[PDB]
Write a protein that binds this DNA or RNA. Structure first.
Ligand SMILES: Nc1ncnc2c1ncn2[C@H]1C[C@H](O)[C@@H](COP(=O)(O)OP(=O)(O)OP(=O)(O)O)O1
Ligand SMILES: [Mn+2]
Ligand SMILES: [Mn+2]
Ligand SMILES: [Mn+2]
Ligand SMILES: [Mn+2]
Ligand SMILES: [Mn+2]
Ligand SMILES: [Mn+2]
Ligand code: NA
Ligand code: NA
Length: 324
DNA sequence: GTCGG
DNA sequence: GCTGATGCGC
DNA sequence: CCGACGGCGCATCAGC
């Protein structure tokens, strides 16, 4: 927040490009600029100063000059005043409503929370849940509540089977003092990259979590991925409903998976980019050597996060240092 | 929108 | 009824 | 100056 005013402006521009313009590469360009500036250890005094940084170009330096001169941005004022733009941007804050749905609703005169309720019959299950918990999903979860959630999950998982391993990742693992949601990585000895598929490994855990009334709603559920809603038990003041993601991954790909799901998202983009500049392709699952005509080798042996960093020659960064 | 081809 | 096409979130 | 920029699990539904 040395340069908080500039990164806020870039984020808002990013959001417009994704939600209204449906221009995903521009969205990513703005987030890339906002990230590099956030890293930058000096108060930016001019566009020319920012232009020095990778990810910041001609148009963004011009925008930085204007914000710096006036404290605002003409484009953003116009956009914030534009009815269709403003409304599309708003509806996408509902989980389940993306750029296409929002634009479609707006074309139909649906543009507010109240309009959404009046027309709930036009919403799908995920969207109705998103409406239902609209305010709740916009609150942050403080680390104290995160640690209480960590306890319920690890313990209920134990009760399905003591050999399951559940690891909370995302911002919680990066040590952040508050979190957007809860991300849970799951492994079991019976499920590896070979293992011959066993139904209900994730289902068993999801059903227990439901049984103890921790998980209250399902958004999507399959054999490897559950997205849903959860809520700490109330004695007293009802706790807000939270989003929870659970991913079941093959035991022998656990470190790749832990690297990936700890993030951050920008950090992951940065790592896999740097990976290429060393002859490796990283995904959620494997690190593989690359070569000449684009031949990605077999997965290299990994038994620690750190092992991945070595392959690509980065100093090890503790989870706390990947929040980009 | 930005950068490397 | 089905499934390719597409959206959404990550 | 142009083209690349990450891909995937899951849900829904237009068009047969
Ligand atoms: N767009 C994406 N596509 C694929 N993976 C992603 C994407 N964004 C993030 N990830 C990975 C890296 C993140 O650390 C991890 C968690 O995603 P997510 O829960 O949405 O954000 P986060 O945990 O880093 O912070 P927070 O949830 O508190 O906002 O998933
Ligand atoms: Mn109205
Ligand atoms: Mn998270
Ligand atoms: Mn998440
Ligand atoms: Mn299909
Ligand atoms: Mn162009
Ligand atoms: Mn039909
Ligand atoms: Na630059
Ligand atoms: Na949304």
């Amino acid at each position: 927040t040395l340069n908080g005013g500039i990164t806020d402006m870039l984020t808002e521009l990013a959001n417009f490009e994704k939600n209204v313009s449906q221009a995903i590469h521009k969205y990513n360009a703005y987030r890339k600029a906002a990230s590099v500036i956030a890293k930058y250890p000096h108060k930016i005094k001019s566009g020319a100063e920012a232009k020095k940084l990778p990810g910041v170009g001609t148009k963004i330096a011009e925008k930085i000059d204007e914000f710096l001169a006036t404290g605002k941005l003409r484009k953003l004022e116009k956009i914030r005043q534009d009815d269709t733009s403003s409304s599309i941007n708003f509806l996408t804050r509902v989980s389940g409503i993306g750029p296409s749905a929002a634009r479609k609703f707006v074309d139909e005169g649906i543009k507010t929370l109240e309009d959404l309720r009046k027309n709930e019959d036009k919403l799908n299950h995920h969207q109705r849940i998103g409406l239902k918990y609209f305010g709740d999903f916009e609150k942050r979860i403080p680390r104290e509540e995160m640690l209480q959630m960590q306890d319920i999950v690890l313990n209920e998982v134990k009760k399905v089977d003591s050999e399951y391993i559940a690891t909370v990742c995302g911002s919680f693992r990066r040590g952040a003092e508050s979190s957007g949601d809860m991300d849970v990585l799951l492994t079991h000895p019976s499920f590896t990259s070979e293992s011959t598929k066993q139904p209900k490994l994730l289902h068993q855990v999801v059903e227990q979590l439901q049984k103890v009334h921790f998980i209250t709603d399902t958004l999507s559920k399959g054999e490897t991925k559950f997205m849903g809603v959860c809520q700490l038990p109330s004695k007293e003041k009802e706790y807000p409903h939270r989003r929870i993601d659970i991913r079941l991954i093959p035991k022998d790909q656990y470190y790749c998976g832990v690297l990936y799901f700890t993030g951050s998202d920008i950090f992951n983009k940065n790592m896999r980019a740097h990976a290429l500049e060393k002859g490796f392709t990283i995904n959620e699952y494997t690190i593989r050597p690359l070569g000449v005509t684009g031949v990605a080798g077999e997965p290299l042996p990994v038994d620690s996060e750190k092992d991945i960093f070595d392959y690509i020659q980065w100093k090890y960064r503790e989870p706390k240092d990947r929040s980009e």
